[PDB]
């Protein structure tokens, strides 16, 4: 994972206030100046602040930026709809070799309806590709809300990674997200298993989907 | 004004080399750096260095010293990223960047130019030509899901209907996920009552126009 933490989502309703933290090393965030960006698709990454807590011109004031010790954080005090993009905390850090380090992103949304959990479908594969000598596990993820998740699977009770490819979360019709996992197995991997499991953490929690041959 | 625009979208097979640009205008090019960094799919950004407009020299973060390099037009106020023998994890989208020179005195060459970002240039390392999908049926009282995996096709877009389009109550076209190879995959799902599964008739068709592909396929349990 990335060298600093961020959480993947935060959330609130419109006014209200949230944090997100940045937790490093002493030879990065707490020794060193840190900026905030925020990324909203279609635009190119913006400065949000510097220097812990400078607003570059144009940048609102309920935004507001901090350090302490090894962590930095950034409020947003009154969420309001332009608000929601991806947030990414960044630090020279002076122990690798000297690099500046980032975060590995904050998902921001104001809510405009309840959370909601994902339903999660896991399809095994078919006749006809295992008739074709190959093999692909599909596990579909639909209506969660914040959308993030974070997509394991695991062969048996092993976690795997490779052969999986996941794609990021997509808006759907109803505002809610979607999201695909695909494991791919040889036919003999998928056969010599006695189940796979594909595991979905949304906001902290994780649903398991589990298909058997 | 601080502007950076850069080169258009890249497809390279592996091994192969890229070169991306970034324009810059606004200001005075060789009073201050260029910044470079990049972001893998799901990654958090990665610094890749910088470089000297004045006197030219590079500076490389570890992890990007060897098959990239910084250089530089001055006459035409361009950087350029080139990357040699391409890999897999090269795939991603490599950003210039620079200060708002504004608020930087007369002159800056360092690592803090990271004030302003170009828009970005995606760089995909595949060896993908032109391909229609393998189409595979997705099958497992309350709801259940059936589907076609519509697998391994170049390039986007694929169509996707279910009995000719008759059917549209509870589908779901999921968008493509676009694996190491360069080949896009994606998924169509049909949410259902359990009762329906075998014992009701249900096609998805299939449509991948650069390959002149139609497929319509029939899905049943088990």
């Known amino acids: 994972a990335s060298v600093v933490t961020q959480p993947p989502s935060v959330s609130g309703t419109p006014g209200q206030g949230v944090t997100i933290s940045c937790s490093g090393g002493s030879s990065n965030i707490g020794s060193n100046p840190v900026n905030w960006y925020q990324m909203v698709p279609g635009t190119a990454p913006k400065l949000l602040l510097y220097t812990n807590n400078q607003r570059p011109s144009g940048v609102p004031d309920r935004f507001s930026g901090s350090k302490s010790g090894t962590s930095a954080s950034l409020a947003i005090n009154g969420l309001q709809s332009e608000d929601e993009a991806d947030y990414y905390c960044a630090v020279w850090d002076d122990s690798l070799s000297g690099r500046w380090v980032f975060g590995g992103g904050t998902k921001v949304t104001v809510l405009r309806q309840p959370k909601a959990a994902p339903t999660v479908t896991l399809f095994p594969p078919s006749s006809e590709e295992l008739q074709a000598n190959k093999a692909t596990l599909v596990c579909l993820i639909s209506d969660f809300y914040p959308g993030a998740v974070t997509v394991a699977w695991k062969a048996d009770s092993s976690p795997v990674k490779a052969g999986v490819e996941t794609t990021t979360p997509s808006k759907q019709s109803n505002n809610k997200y979607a999201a695909s996992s695909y494991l791919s197995l040889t036919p003999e991997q998928w056969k010599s298993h006695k189940s796979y499991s594909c595991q979905v953490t949304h906001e902290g929690s994780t649903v398991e989907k589990t298909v058997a041959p | 004004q601080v502007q950076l625009v850069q080169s258009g979208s890249e497809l390279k097979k592996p091994g192969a080399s890229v070169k991306v640009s970034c324009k810059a205008s606004?200001?005075?090019?060789?009073?201050?750096?260029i910044n470079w960094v990049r972001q893998a799919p799901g990654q958090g950004p990665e610094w890749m260095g910088w470089?000297?407009?004045?006197?030219?020299?590079?500076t490389y973060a570890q992890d990007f010293a060897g098959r990239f390099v910084f250089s530089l037009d001055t006459s035409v106020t361009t950087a350029y990223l080139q990357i040699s023998s391409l890999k897999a994890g090269d795939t991603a989208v490599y950003y210039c960047?620079?200060?708002?020179?504004?608020?930087?005195?007369?002159?800056?060459?360092?690592?803090?130019?990271?004030?302003?970002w170009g828009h970005g240039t995606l760089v995909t390392v595949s060896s993908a030509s032109t391909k229609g999908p393998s189409v595979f049926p997705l099958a497992p009282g309350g709801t259940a899901a059936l589907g076609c995996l519509v697998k391994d096709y170049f390039p986007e877009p694929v169509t996707v209907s279910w009995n000719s389009g008759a059917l549209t109550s509870g589908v779901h076209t999921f968008p493509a996920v676009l694996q190491s190879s360069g080949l896009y995959s994606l998924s169509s799902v049909v949410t259902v009552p359990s009762s329906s599964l075998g014992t009701q008739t249900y096609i998805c068709n299939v449509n991948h126009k650069p390959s002149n592909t139609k497929v319509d396929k029939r899905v049943e349990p088990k």
């Open positions: 960047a620079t200060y708002y020179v504004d608020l930087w005195g007369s002159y800056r060459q360092d690592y803090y130019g990271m004030d302003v």
């Open positions: 470089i000297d407009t004045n006197t030219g020299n590079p």
């Open positions: 606004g200001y005075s090019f060789t009073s201050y750096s």
